[PDB]
Structure formats: structure tokens, C-alpha cells
Write an enzyme that holds these catalytic residues in place. Sequence first.
Site, PDB file in Angstrom:
ATOM      1  N   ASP A  23      -0.704  15.775   8.918  1.00 29.60           N
ATOM      2  CA  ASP A  23      -0.447  14.387   8.722  1.00 29.60           C
ATOM      3  C   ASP A  23       0.921  13.748   9.356  1.00 29.60           C
ATOM      4  OD1 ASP A  23      -0.155  12.042   7.829  1.00 29.60           O
ATOM      5  OD2 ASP A  23       0.550  12.466   5.472  1.00 29.60           O
ATOM      6  N   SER A  49       1.884  -1.642  19.763  1.00 31.27           N
ATOM      7  CA  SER A  49       1.017  -1.800  20.817  1.00 31.27           C
ATOM      8  C   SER A  49       1.160  -3.264  21.211  1.00 31.27           C
ATOM      9  CB  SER A  49      -0.351  -1.914  19.961  1.00 31.27           C
ATOM     10  OG  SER A  49      -1.440  -2.333  20.638  1.00 31.27           O
TER      11      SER A  49
END
Length: 330
Positions: A35, A199
Site C-alpha cells: 500500500d 497530473s
Amino acid sequence: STGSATTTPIDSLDDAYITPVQIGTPAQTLNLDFDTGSSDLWVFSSETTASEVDGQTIYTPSKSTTAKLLSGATWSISYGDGSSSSGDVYTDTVSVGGLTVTGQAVESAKKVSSSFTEDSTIDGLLGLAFSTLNTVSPTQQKTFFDNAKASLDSPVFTADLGYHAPGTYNFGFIDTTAYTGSITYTAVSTKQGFWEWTSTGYAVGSGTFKSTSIDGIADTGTTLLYLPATVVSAYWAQVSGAKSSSSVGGYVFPCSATLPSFTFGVGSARIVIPGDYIDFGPISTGSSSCFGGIQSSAGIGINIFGDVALKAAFVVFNGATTPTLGFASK
């Protein structure tokens, strides 16, 4: 040193991925959920409340000659999906894919929430975010990667998750045969303890690319792609019959649909998530309503590039002094 381990989807929907991990001496092999959105290595154990264990493999520290109680240390964690676990702490030898760390904090669960009990395939989590998120008190502990870093050939690990197929976590090297083209690197903020990046935009299907900054986290421990409501609405508007359902808890779509791809930007590069990756199947057995793999982050408080996004790429988690993230197509 390096390590290389195969990671395997737990079910037919790629809800999560498990990777075998050797703990203790002799080795006890547990299948852990790696994770990158948390920083605790915790396991089902011989200390876990019996009624809360249902099929998991447990770590038994008393059978490990290298286990030592970390005196006074406790841990307690809550995850974004509402699940939680807590317990006490041992140090022991932990190996992943041939890479060994001695003195690793292995957090032994005394209690786990129902979601963990109900998933027989996940024996615990191995956190790979920054050690500043580690929950051990009163002495915070380091992640497996942080402990291994100095010994690694290069201070990196990579995630190469498969779509309905096994993939690979590598530590300490970049497998140049595992991706196509070049890797595009992008800046990381560690301010919130995550692999947080921005992004450069998105496209839906064959549509034009929208240049827009989307701050989010690369999180292998989250199944879906969680993005701003504007972006998500634009995606699902291209699927006839798709709608947001408050009763179901997100966007659903007719199972008869063919889903468009979703592209996200990494610098000037583009990662394309095929439409099929966004299908999470019937909301309930036999239903013709299917659950979408792109969902709104509104009210999570952060955008999450979970498995839906990451499995479309070869992802470099660069833990150099100034960390960065790399994405390549594959």
C-alpha cells in the site's frame, strides 16, 4: 541489493493485489497488500481476536527465533475506506522477493475491522508511503522501503500491476524490459506523507486532451481512480445510461455498455487506461447495473490514482533525497 516479488489480484475484479512476504525465522509467509498510501506493516497474528480471524494466515511471533517485542509500542490505523486495525509491535526479519530487512517493525493486530475479517485473502498490509505517516506510538517506525533503502542498488521501488493478471513489485532496480518507450518523471510533495504529484490533465476516449492540474496520490492500496467531480462527470457523460447513484455509492452504468478509455497526463506524456479497466462488474450478483472504476473524490479531500490508473503504467517510486514519481506505458 535488490528484491523482486510477484503481486497477484485477490479476485476477478482486481479489487486488490497480494504479494508474499517472509516474516521471522523460520520464515512465515503471509500475503500482504502493498500500500503506497500508508506506512504501517501490519499482520493478522496469533494475538488477533479469534472471532475476527476468518481464513487468513497468521504471524505467530512466539515461533520466530528472531522476533522481539518492541516494548510499550502500540499502533492504530484508520483507512480511507472506513476500515481499521490496531495492536502491538514486534521487530523481526522481513524479506520480500529476496530482499531482507532485519529489525523491521511488524505490527501485530489485536483487533481488525469487519472488512479485513471478511477478506480471507489479505493477511495484512505493507505500507510504502513515507514513514512520517507510520502510526506506531510512542516511537514512530520506518517502512520496509525506508529500512531497505541504503542497501538497495538504487533507492527506488517499482509497481507493475496487472489487469486481471499477476504483476511485479521490484526493489532497488528499474527493469528496462518491463515498459515501452521512456519513463516520464514528475515532482512529488511529501508534505502529507504520500506519493503526491500533479497530473497535467486528461482525455476521455478519443476526445481532446484537457490541460489542467490535478493534484493526487499514487496509491496502490486503493482500488479505483478518484478524481474531481468535473472530470468524472465528463467521463461518465460519454456512457449512455450512466448515472451517479447515492444508494449504490457512486457512478453506475449499464453492464451492456462499451466503456471509453481514460487518459491522464504525466508531464507531456500520456497514460491510457483502457475502457475495460474501468468496469467493476455488477453492483450485486446478477444485476445489469455495473459499478464504475472512475469515481468522484469530492468529500475524500484528495484525488487518488489507485489501481485502475496505476495498472495502466509501469510506475517508479523514486526515494532519492528529493523523491519523484516515474510513469511509463507498458
